[PDB]
Swiss-Prot record, chains A, B:
EC number(s) given by UniProt: 6.1.1.1
Entry GO MF terms: ATP binding; interleukin-8 receptor binding; RNA binding; small molecule binding; tRNA binding; tyrosine-tRNA ligase activity
Binding-site residues for L-tyrosine, renumbered to this chain: Y36, Y163, Q167, D170, Q185
Principal location class: cytoplasm
Range covered out of full length: 4 to 342 of 528
Self-association and partners: Homodimer. Interacts (when binding to resveratrol) with PARP1; interaction stimulates the poly-ADP-ribosyltransferase activity of PARP1.
Family, per entry: Belongs to the class-I aminoacyl-tRNA synthetase family.
Chain sites annotated for binding trans-resveratrol: Y36, Q167, D170
Domain of life (superkingdom): Eukaryota
Consequence of changing D295Y: Found in a patient with proximal-predominant motor neuropathy; likely pathogenic; loss of function
Name of the protein in question: Tyrosine--tRNA ligase, cytoplasmic
Sequence motif: 'HIGH' region, positions: 41-49
GO biological process, any: tyrosyl-tRNA aminoacylation
Amino acid sequence: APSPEEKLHLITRNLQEVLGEEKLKEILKERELKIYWGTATTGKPHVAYFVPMSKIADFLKAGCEVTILFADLHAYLDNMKAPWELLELRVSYYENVIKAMLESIGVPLEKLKFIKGTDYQLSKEYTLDVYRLSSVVTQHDSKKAGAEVVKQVEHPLLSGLLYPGLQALDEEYLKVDAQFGGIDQRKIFTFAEKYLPALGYSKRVHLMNPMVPGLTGKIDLLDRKEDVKKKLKKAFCEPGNVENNGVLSFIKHVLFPLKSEFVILRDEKWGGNKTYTAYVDLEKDFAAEVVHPGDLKNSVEVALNKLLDPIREKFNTPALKKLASAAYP
Amino acid sequence: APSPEEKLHLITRNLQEVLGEEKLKEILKERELKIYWGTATTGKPHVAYFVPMSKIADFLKAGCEVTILFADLHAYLDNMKAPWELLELRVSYYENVIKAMLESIGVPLEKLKFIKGTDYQLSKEYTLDVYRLSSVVTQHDSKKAGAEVVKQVEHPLLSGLLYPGLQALDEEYLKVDAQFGGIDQRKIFTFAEKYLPALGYSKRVHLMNPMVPGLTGKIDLLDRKEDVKKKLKKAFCEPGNVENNGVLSFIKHVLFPLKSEFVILRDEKWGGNKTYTAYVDLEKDFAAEVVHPGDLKNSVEVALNKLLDPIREKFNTPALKKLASAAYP
Ligand SMILES: N[C@@H](Cc1ccc(O)cc1)C(=O)O
Ligand SMILES: N[C@@H](Cc1ccc(O)cc1)C(=O)O
Ligand SMILES: [K+]
Ligand SMILES: [K+]
Ligand SMILES: [K+]
Ligand SMILES: [K+]
């Protein structure tokens, strides 16, 4: 209530790939899994963040101890997306917006830990492990590890090479069993599995989501009803096409796991509303062309405005506007 | 007593190159120069260390505030010449041996500051400047800067790229006006002159010695009379050749600045002893072949045993043997 097998299924459902199944099952047989997710405090979170937030939700339902890392320094090291004062402001926008998302999807916040990188990444023992790690890692391996993650520019900065080793050490200093992120990470993840043990630390389990296409190709978490509508009307959803369909993906990765069902809103003329209890059923009806793109979008629009409603409320304070504007000028 | 002009001459004599003459003279017009020298606590110091020690001696005679940096972390980052426990032991061998050298040449120790890198290089603000610097420096520039200094290996380690930026930041954290080292450094020095100002810190004066050939091509600071003799008898000193002559170089860079003269020990049959008050005079007599290699070596041998005598005494304790043996097993 839940058994280790129900835990495993909740944690790993919808992932593209699990590294470390063997240790993962060892742990779940005995105790709760410790896991984190990291986000560099970079650009404004948009509705696509509900994809990783839905997995965090599943981790909590499974009994996991979840940490969220606001990787402020990593934002700095990644070709200075975020500068030195103006990192701290984005940290608070990210903390606020992320907690409102999770509240909105009904995730208990109370056993979720939020930490920011500069709470621990400038400490002496951490900094010492960074040098230690620098003495066994090649520029080659460090460069290879960040290829998909750090912005690739004409003359690579030294910070870009540091970035992967810090993300690996994060696993140890957050004292987790596992890290969850997108499949893009994978080379950083495999990097951490190889080098952490050279520092005498255990390799971690790694859980990778697919790169899920976006709803519009961005819809902002604070956008008005009216802009959600207009952004959706532009959204690309081809009749009968179940590949490369950001609308269907949003349903699969966010709306189904939320209530374990999805309601298509459809006029009586075409069958009336239908409630699907599994994604594969909706997909089949869409391929068969008995769910129209316009009905699919409207069913997502309704459900998405339900998600965004609280968030827009909370952030309808003048301090939060100050924060938003200050954070992104 | 000394004027700024006598100061400048003492500080810059025998150098191959001065960067920053303009600021250097500005400072000496008003106050004492702050300067350091750094040595990675790597292999056992040998008699060739008297070359940089003679310049440190001149810096003190000039009124300079001199810092000596025992760069323990740099020893680690430089392809792990020195490991983690066994760094600290070498630091104390280096501190002991260096102070005995300076005592031996009559340098007052009392206004010389000794510091080791790990006293300050793991601190938070230092570590933050390391990331800061990493965000403006390219792998390319950092790699280019260490080419002559860090051991170049088949697959370069990330630590090798860090090494130059740390040596630059050292200038700021030691609060010096200037750094003295060998000409090999030069690319690290020019690196520091370019990037320190991008962190909002001033560029420093840089003072570079030539790469002086060695006495035997090593003579250890603790070698017995008898091994100094045998090592010298092998030493290469071609008749009439004043280039590439480690014996003459040792005289020019160590023995002349020590007493401002040098005594050639020579039998009456060939003129008897002669006292030279300038290097250029000795050089001329050697080119002319009226100072023989065997007399040149014996004159150096005598003077060198005078240098090493105290040092061998001091280190004739069982703790110091313990230290030596422990440091180099
Ligand atoms: N690399 C992650 C962010 C992150 C940073 C540090 C970590 O420890 C973990 C994750 C991303 O691209 O989104
Ligand atoms: N690079 C110097 C050692 C050193 C290290 C750090 C410094 O800040 C200065 C000097 C050498 O090759 O001998
Ligand atoms: K981000
Ligand atoms: K990013
Ligand atoms: K050295
Ligand atoms: K060395």
